[model samples]
Each structure stands twice: as structure tokens, then as C-alpha cells.
Target: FMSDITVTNWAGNITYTAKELLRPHSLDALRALVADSARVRVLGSGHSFNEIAEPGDGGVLLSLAGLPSVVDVDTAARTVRVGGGVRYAELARVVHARGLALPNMASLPHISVAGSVATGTHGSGVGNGSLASVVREVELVTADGSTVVIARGDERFGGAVTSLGALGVVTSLTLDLEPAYEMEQHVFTELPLAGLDPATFETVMAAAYSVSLFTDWRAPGFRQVWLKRRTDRPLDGFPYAAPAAEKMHPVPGMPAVNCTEQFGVPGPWHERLPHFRAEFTPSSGAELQSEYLMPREHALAALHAMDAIRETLAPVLQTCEIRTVAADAQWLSPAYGRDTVAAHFTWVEDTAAVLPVVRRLEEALVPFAARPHWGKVFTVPAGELRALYPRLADFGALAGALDPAGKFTNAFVRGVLA
Candidate 1:
């Protein structure tokens, strides 16, 4: 591992000074780099809102993107082995072409398979879980310079599955897939953001496979309600398909809105989910995002508390996104403890102006048992992480065993796991 380089993640955020940036073209090279460094971290798409993938000054940064692409798809076992560096959206397209789907993926398909699962990133559905929940087995190279593969149902598997980048550098992962399915979204403009009783809240979002309610602080009501659903029926009687939500925007430096797929036209399931399809998708550009997953039953309570903070939040609030998904037991998952209802807050991108509001929201949602996403903006420290997961200690223990000298520890990891 040669010394000195700048490591920056996607989203044009989170940069770090590192002792060295190691690009491992093979598993052996990755192992050699890990063995040589006292402090090391695995780098992927770098899409996280937090510093989960950041390796501070004097540390080693390992890039897993060099790992070979998925070399196997064992249909008999219902599993697909993919390189840890695979982008979720790209992987989704590849798998769907082969009549398989990764089960669920994050809103931004650009996120890495390993990083998303490590941080418990998820898409939406009433009974569906996050990306990590679909993991069947993962092979990682531990800090002590040993390779280990943890499979589902093993005693240590649960702890290893979602350890973020803490336990080790995941080289490859095997995910449980299902028959590829197609989806068409209906972006509805109806839904109350605040002051909704439990029954009304669930009923409105019930029609689609996923629902996202967006709001800006001035009004406590939802401004846009984007609903995506799987549709198999033909277009003879069905309405035209909505273009992918991400295809509406343009490239950063470009001067035009690139809308090849008309906003209301329909398309395949793979085209509907990713927020950035071809990088010119038009949507809100500058925002600070913070999301949390709490028990589904606590949706009303969480929203009511949020309603109370709307006025106080206007200074930094750009919008808020509320979604629901199924529960899972992935060790480091925010939804690890219970079935979840995820409410995400997107604030104006000024950190100084937005952080205070984030803190206030954090305090308000605590009573409802909110668990922050490991990769998002939040002030919650290790105590919050500990309180959120009953498996916290187990994951910590495994991470310590894997990286005794704290190779994966960053300021954020210290905040949540130290």
C-alpha cells in the first residue's frame, strides 16, 4: 500500500485524507493490503450520508470494485453470488435480464451491494425488508488476515451479515433472489403529511408496493406522494406507464433537462426504481437527508411528533419522506429489532442550519423507538446504536474479534460502535 491520496465518495460528499488508497485487482492483493495496514477500510460507491466508508488520515482504504463480477447464479439454491463492489442498480438490471431479482433494492440503484447492505439501506414495501435482509451468505476477509464465509443459519452468521464495514472487507455476497417481477408506478398527489390517524395513514399507502410522502416545512401536508407498484397486466386497458422517477433530471454541469422517457410513460420494473437513471434525472438536487426505521405500529406517533416540529424545522427543511417496509433480523439493521416504518427527513443542504433541526427531530422521535440509518445524517452516538439493536453487543464483539486493532473504526463507527 503506497502512501497519500484523496478519497471522496459519490454524492460529492465525504472526503478523507488517507495513508494510502489501495486498489486491489484481486482477492490476494486485497488481503495483502489489509495485512499491511494497522487501520483499513473497504471503499465502494461511497453513497452513504455518513462516514461509514471513510478512512481518516493515516489509514488504508481498500477498493473492492476490482473484485470480479458475480461468477455464479445457482438457481437451484435460489442464490446469486455477486462481487461486493457491484452497483445495486446495475446488478438489478443484470439479474432481471436473467429472470431474477435481488428481492429489494434501495431508491438509488447506484449504491454498492455491500455498502447498502452493510448500512441496512432499503427500498419500500409493507412486508418487504431492506437490502441486507436478502443476504444468504457473505465472504469477508477479516482484519487478522483470514478469509471467512458466513452462511445463513450459522450461529455467527446473524452477527456477520450487517456489520457495515466493521467486521471485515466483504469480497463477495450471495443473495436470495426471486422470479423477476415488473413494476409500474403511479405518482399520486394525495396524502396528508401530518395529523393522520392510524387507519387513514395505512389505507392511503396500501395500494402500492411502495409509497413516499414528500413535504417541505411550510405545510405539514405531503406535497408529492410517489407510489410504485408491480403490474403484470397489458396496456390495452391499463394507463400509460410513468417514467422512472430518476430520469427527470439533467447532468450536473449540463444546461438542459434530459427526459428521454416522458414523465408519464410506463416502463419495465428495473427502470422504475433507481433515483438516478443515466445521471440526468431531475429531482431535488441539494438536500441533507436523515432517515430512521422504527416499528410500523409507531407510524402515527412518529408523524404526530414530527408535525409538532414542522414550524421549528422550516429553516432547514426541504422535504420529508415517509415509507414502510417489512422487518428483518440483520444484526446491524435499523429494522433489526422490529417490523418497520421509515420516515426520512430531507433538509436544505446547509449543515450549520440543518444540524440543530436534525437533533430536535432525533429527540422527538426517541420515545417511539426510532432507529437511525447507519449511513444517514444524525447526532445519535454509540448509545443510540446500542439502544436500537439487541444484537449490538454481538456485532461489536464480532467486529472486535475480526479487527482487534480497530482497522475499520472511523469517527462515525466510534460514535456508533466503540
Candidate 2:
């Protein structure tokens, strides 16, 4: 069935041109849709700022939000099976209410579990893996309208976890869970400019359970250092800096009313781990986003690179966040091969003005072989992907094998594998 509603991404940067935009409420309807469509793609909360989730040349676009929600918990195994359409916001509470919690969460829980994991969206922590790393199993309806369940031990498991919607429609996912916990968050202001020194910077990064440094590129030093400390242990080797006297939004004046509790407030993990409250829109309201993730060692130099071009970047940049991510086995994850340090930007919504700024920033980050987050803006080309993702060829082979008809391959995915 064709849809009457217009479909646009969260940022409204890209409007989909799918032949049909349908929400199938039953598995039979979904299978029929996938089985017959020449190309297929799914929309999960429409959070992607790019066309990764957009349907391919006149293909059908599907949304799973109308399907029966699955949040089956296995308390003993400490794992939960959630429907692909389930956003972190919906999953978090059920897991928490049932006496469990996810190991980490994206800055906003508004994104779908499958979409976020499939695109390698991550949260901050030197030890925390990308959101996909927690996924122990992936169940999807491949191109042939057949159900396939790939688990952690399967050969294609790594490839399946971060399929980028090039694999198929993810029906459900089983993720690793942990005992419920609480966290205390503190916000520190103006890290000394000299603190960018390799030795000092790395110290602040690993000081708390999960720490993120923010800057507007107009400041002398970091605008703020957000520390989310786990209740099980105390933050270690933390350097001294003035604590923010009051609660603050990551992007000042954007509206602090929707942000999470700050000022050393002790709250449940789900409440404190994320920067924004679950009820609010998780997006930057109206902004473009881009991020560069590279090995920790290159972070200092690359960060220095951003500062070198700070004068050129300030106008189009809103606020930028610097965070760390642990390595994972997911073949397409940005942090796949190394512990990562990443710089994420919330850019002015005007794509035309921000376009060149993105290019300049990408050039600064190129030497490090920095990988751009899959769902964000980037100038990285297909040839560079082979060098960036050592397992890309293997992933391509896997995609070809599962979807021999090429029913799920979109121009963007083709270009990425180009």
C-alpha cells in the first residue's frame, strides 16, 4: 500500500522518495512487502541525518513501529530480546523496571535500538563498546522474505550486527544487560588550554566512568567537561578544574529544561547516563551532525587540527563534543579495531554553509584514517573505506550472499561499497 504522508528525516535534511511508504502491522504483510519490492529499507525513528535509511531507487520504505512490540526479558541470562522498532527510551524503562539496565546508552534514547546499533552510534567511555557490541543476536527478514536469526557465535554475526540497512529489515535484537545501577554526574568548566597535551587529555578522558569534553570553538579552552561516574566505584586520577556552579545545557541557550539532571546529582543509570531526558526530542532541534572517530593516539593531534581551523569553523559550528569509545568486533563499527577518541559536531542546519566546513574538517582528520560515523555527513569515499574498514570486503561478500538479488542494496550502500 502506498502512503499519503510525506517522509522526512528527524533533521528534515533529506526527504525520502520511496515508491511506497508503508507500515505493515503484521508479519505476513511485512514479508509480502519485502518479498515483492525491488529494493527495501526501514525507517526507525527517522533519526539518520543521511540517506542510509532512505529507500533505494524507487524502492518501498517500511517502518516497523506498527508491529507488535517485543521486550522479552531473560532475567537469568541478563539479556533482553527487543523488537527492531524499539527505541532506547522504550527499552530502558522496561529493562530498569524489571531490575536490569543496559551497559551504555547513546546521548539520547530517542533512537531505535536496531537503527542505532546498525549504524554504530555510540556513547562515551574508554571501556564501553559501541551500542551494537551489546547485541548478542540479530533477527531479520532478508531479501527473500525469509527469517534469519544470526547470533554472536555465527560467522556472519559481526557483519549482521551493524548491517547499515544494506542487509535487511531487522525484526528483533537480543542485547546484553546488567544489574540495575545508579550514576552521579558532574559538569566541570574551562579545562585549561594547555590540558590538551597528550598526557593531560588522556587523563581527563579516563578519569570518570564516562567523560565528554565540550567546546564551542569560540572558547579559550573546553567549554565544559561532563563526567558520568558509576556508583560502584570512585573516579580515579581526575585532574582539578572548577566545577560548574549550576546545571547547564551542552549547547548553551538551546533550552536547559529538557536536559538531564546535573550538579553532582545522583540518579538512576537510565536517567543520568543520557544527556537529555527521554520525553524530549533527542535531536539538536534543527542541526546537521558529523563526527570523526580515530585511534586514541591520533586524537590529540587531530584535535589540535580542529583548533588550528577553529577560526574557520566557529561560524557554522554550534557545539562540539569529544568522547572516547572502547573497541568492538562489529565489523563496521567506527571503533572496530581500536579504542577510539571522537569529535562530534552539531552544525548549523544550513547544509549549504556547513558543506565546506565539513570538507575542511574531513581533510584535517584524513591523515589519521578517521572513520566517519555511518549515518552522519562525510566526504570519505568508497576506496578509502577498504583501508578504513579492513573487513569491508568480507562484509560485502556477506551482503551479496544473503541478498543475492540485490534487493536491499541502495545507491548509498553501493557507493559505500564502491
Candidate 3:
């Protein structure tokens, strides 16, 4: 059914007005909607930190929330086909129930399967590959109200899969799954910033399934290290259920961590992975965010540079986030050809205050050659950014070929693409 829907995520921010939000349960409804509209934009959970998912002034917005979940799972084939609306947490539960895993996962699980893969989303691991790398095929609802299937061997597959929702509306994706396993998170508070050796960042991160570093200090240091390890051993002395509601609270007087919506809480894999399934993300009560990815080796230097201006960013910044991911060859991937360390900064409430800080940070990190998340804030001109992406030209060509009329393209698309 199609109805007018105002969408807002767990953060209670980033809302959008749509004349009609279409929730299609199947590809037929998706294609039919495209056939019915002259202009439309597809949206997932709207967790993006930028305008990538927002339709321009009068365009229609399409939500895949109604899509069927976990279309098919071929254990022997070690692959799974999932609907675009499926969230990482939901997918994890189903996959784990079947004794299989996806090999990697992002920090938060509210992100949608199609949305994550479309934006090259990944978890930390020294040599681990990004989510899109596991894709064997994708079914897209193209501009012309037709369906297009891009498979593994296709030359354009890599670029199109991570096209930032510009190529088409991803309806379903096929991922190469791995064996399911138990895991434990060893969250260490206050890891010294000086302890990080640029050369060993990737190697150290690779030892676990994923890693998250949180800090809001202007000093050159990290305040906590949340290392998530995937294993079969029973979780030690950890509470079987989430901590009591009142028990979950931030450290006394500690400011927010990032744009994430939670702080204190312990729960099952399903509740914790999404971060918000329990209460709110750690960075809740904020209004803005921006993230960028650079080769993992440069993380230490970047951190040092940002530390120099921490005071300038503190008043406006709710928190900062550090995460890692293995590299991939996806044409538009932030870590396109190299393993990357991702950093996220969520601002208090206004972007006007955030843009300049982000701009300065970009300037300082240019030497490190960072790639902004396609769905995040960036001021880099296309010419300069294109140089960082060897496959940029090819991706542009593919976008041109797949969406000649630029039906999926908007102001942000032109800014980043053209």
C-alpha cells in the first residue's frame, strides 16, 4: 500500500516529507511503482549522514520496508539472498539460526542489507573485505521501470553495487555467507592514543571480528576500545539479558560519543548489534554527522592531526567514532582498493557549525588520501576526488549507461558524480 509517511529514525532526527511512501513487498510492486512515477528516490533506514537518500524538492520517496526478508538461503552454496529492507540485526539472527555468518558486520545493525552494500559498509578486520565484496549478484529496479540483474563476473558489477543509490533501486542482493560462530566483546576503557602504531593498526584490528574506538577529547588519545570478537566459547559472566533500563547510563559527566542513538546497555546479539534495539544509540540526541574512510595505516597520523584541533570541535561535536574494515575493489568503495579505517563525527544540532570543522579535517587528512562516505558530508571537488579513485571514471560511465536520464541522480549526485 502507498501512503503519505513522515520518516524519522531512532535518533528522533533526520526526518523527511514524502507525498507518498510506497512499501512494496515484492519486485513487481517496485517495478510497477517506477512505471507509475516520473520521479522517485529509494530509501532504506535513512541512517545516512548526508542528503544522498533524500529526494529533491518535489520527487517521490520509495521505501522498501515491505519487501520480504531473507528470500533464500543456500547453505551448501554458502550464499543468501535477502530483500533490500532487511536490517543487519535481523539478517544476523536468521543467518545465525542456520549456523552460518556473513563473515563481517558493521558497528550498528539497523543499517539495511541493500543500503549497507550499496554504500560499501563494512566492519573492522585487517584483511577482511567490505560487504559489497561478498555480493554475487543484485536485482535492481532501473529508471525505465525495468529490472536489471548484475552478476559477479560482470565488469560493471563492482561499481554499480556501491553506486550510492544512484544507479538504481536495489531490490535484492546475493551475499556469499560464511559459517556461523559465537563471539565475545572485550571492551577496554581508555586505550591510550599514543599506543597506536600506524604500521600495526590493520594487523591488530584483523585479530577480531570488529573494533570500535570512542572518544570526544581534544587530546591525542582514545578513551575506550570496544573489541568485538567472534568465537564459539560461551560469553563470560555477561548478563544473559540486557542490563536493566536504569542500569544503563553513560559514565558520569561524560559528553555524548557520536551521532549514534546509546550508551549503557548489555543484551543479546540481536539487541546489541543494532545499538538502538535496546534504547538509543550512544550518540543519541544529536542532529548531524559526517564520516570518511582512509587507509588504515594513516589512522594514527589522522588522529594526531585531529587532536590538535579537538577543542575547536568539542563544543559542536557530540562524539567521534573510529572503526575499521578490510579493503575491496568496489569502484566506488571508500576503501576501494585498500583496507580502510573509518571515522565518524556527529555534531550537536547544526550543520553550519559542522561543515567548516569537517572541511578543515579533510584538508588536514588530504595527505592521507581519505574518501568520504558517499552518503556523508564532503566538500572535495570531483576532479580531486576522482584522482583518488582509479575506477571513478568507469563508475561515472556505468552510471551514465545505467541511468542515462539521471532519474536517480539529484543535486548531491551531480556534486559527487559530475
Question: Looking at candidate 2, what is the lDDT of residue 21?
Answer: 64
Candidate 2 all-Cα RMSD: 1.6
284-354: candidate 2 lDDT, tens digit per residue = 36889999899988888888888889988899988999999999798889998899998999998999999
Off by over 4 Å in 3: 1-17, 199-207, 232-285
> What is the model-wide C-alpha lDDT for candidate 1?
0.71
Cα lDDT listed for each candidate: 0.71, 0.87, 0.70
lDDT of 3: 0.70
Q: How does residue 372 of candidate 3 score in lDDT?
A: 85
Question: Which prediction has the highest lDDT against the true structure?
Answer: 2
Q: Compare candidates 1 and 3 on lDDT and give the better one.
A: 1
| Ranked candidates, highest TM-score first | 2, 1, 3
Q: Count the backbone clashes (under 3 Å) in each candidate.
A: 8, 0, 12
Question: Of the candidates numbered 2 and 3, which has the greater lDDT value?
Answer: 2
Q: Which ten residues in a row have the lowest lDDT in candidate 2?
A: 233-242
The full ranking of all candidates by lDDT, starting with the best, is: 2, 1, 3
